[PDB]
Design a protein around this ligand. Structure first.
Ligand code: O6E
Length: 315
């Protein structure tokens, strides 16, 4: 059951919306989350319709960015786009990736400043991460616990999550919280052990390709994807920033009091291995912007390399 449900579960989180777009320069809509028109401020077919031109959802200037982005040799290099809904001029980060049927566009509301205040957030993010990487590189060697303690302190500073932990997989695949930074009125999870089966093999496997996963609100009602009747299976959402969590895990989050989460792979060699996760929790809803998630992502690559070095060294 799990892998196909996670890969093609037909649902996204309601803080954003998702389009699937033809990859042939027509920009025809192949699919859209049912909330797309509402989130785009779009109350003779409606602009959010199967086969309609996705470019006509956005300002004319936005459309020109989508064309370059789709035409580029490597789509991820322009992520995220800064674009505007046609009618309302509502701004979004657009994150684009390719799948079997076309291009998936994840649309995350940006919180409206001027573009220079917008640039300052993104700038400070990328530099906050290089700073955290160099603070890790400044650490004396042969001390993994100190490396882990430092990562959680920086990640908490960056993200503002109530709780940030390093979760290490033991050989038998059960996990242990081996480092923790949290606001001091929260019960610590540091030193707690959790069964292997809390994180199915499918979830652990997917973290190799999908290194960063954010859930805004475990209680939010997952949003259905409307798709072309010609598509023979549910849209591949495995790479979506907005993919809705499996119902079991949504309930696990609510039982744990983690209303919001940010979870990130710790990758090493062995032959690349998932050694652990950096797990972030919030006791209320939270969805930090993409550029800050991108920052953590390259911090976690950096963390992974230093960690692997310190390992393959006892080895
Ligand atoms: C449901 C019957 C079973 C189940 C399924 C399940 N679990 C996940 C994913 C995760 N589980 C996590 C567990 C923890 N989070 C913590 O903070 C701690 C401990 C302090 C644990 C042990 C984590 C992390 C994940 C990753 C989630 C993420 O944010 O990506 C999934 C996959 C959900 C998805 O949609 O990707 C599933 C199906 N969990 C259970 O407890 C029961 C047995």
């Amino acid at each position: 059951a799990y892998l196909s449900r996670i890969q093609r579960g037909g649902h996204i989180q309601p803080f954003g919306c998702t389009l699937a777009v033809a990859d042939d320069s027509s920009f025809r809509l192949l699919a859209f989350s049912e909330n797309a028109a509402d989130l785009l401020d779009l109350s003779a077919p409606p602009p959010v319709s199967l086969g309609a031109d996705a470019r006509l959802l956005f300002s004319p200037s936005s459309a020109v960015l989508l064309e370059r982005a789709f035409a580029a040799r490597e789509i991820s290099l322009l992520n995220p786009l800064w674009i505007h809904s046609r009618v309302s001029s509502k701004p979004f980060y657009a994150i684009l990736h390719r799948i079997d049927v076309g291009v998936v566009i994840d649309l995350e509301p940006a919180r409206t400043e001027d573009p220079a205040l917008s640039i300052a957030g993104a700038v400070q993010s990328q530099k906050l991460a290089v700073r955290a990487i160099s603070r890790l590189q400044a650490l004396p060697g042969g001390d993994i616990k100190l490396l882990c303690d430092t990562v959680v302190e920086h990640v908490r500073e960056l993200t503002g999550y109530d709780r940030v932990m390093v979760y290490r997989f033991h050989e038998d695949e059960h996990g242990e919280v081996v480092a923790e930074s949290r606001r001091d009125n929260l019960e610590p999870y540091l030193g707690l052990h959790y069964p292997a089966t809390d994180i199915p093999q499918a979830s652990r496997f997917l973290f190799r390709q999908n290194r960063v996963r954010m859930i805004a609100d475990c209680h939010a009602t997952p949003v259905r994807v409307i798709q072309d009747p010609g598509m023979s299976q549910p849209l591949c959402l495995v790479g979506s920033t907005l993919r809705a969590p499996h119902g079991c895990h949504a309930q696990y989050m609510a039982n744990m009091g983690s209303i919001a989460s940010l979870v990130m792979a710790v990758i090493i060699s062995s032959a690349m291995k998932l050694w652990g996760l950096v797990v972030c929790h919030h006791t209320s809803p939270r969805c930090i912007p993409f550029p800050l998630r991108y920052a953590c992502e390259f911090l976690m690559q950096a963390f992974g390399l230093q960690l692997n070095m310190e390992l393959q060294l006892a080895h």
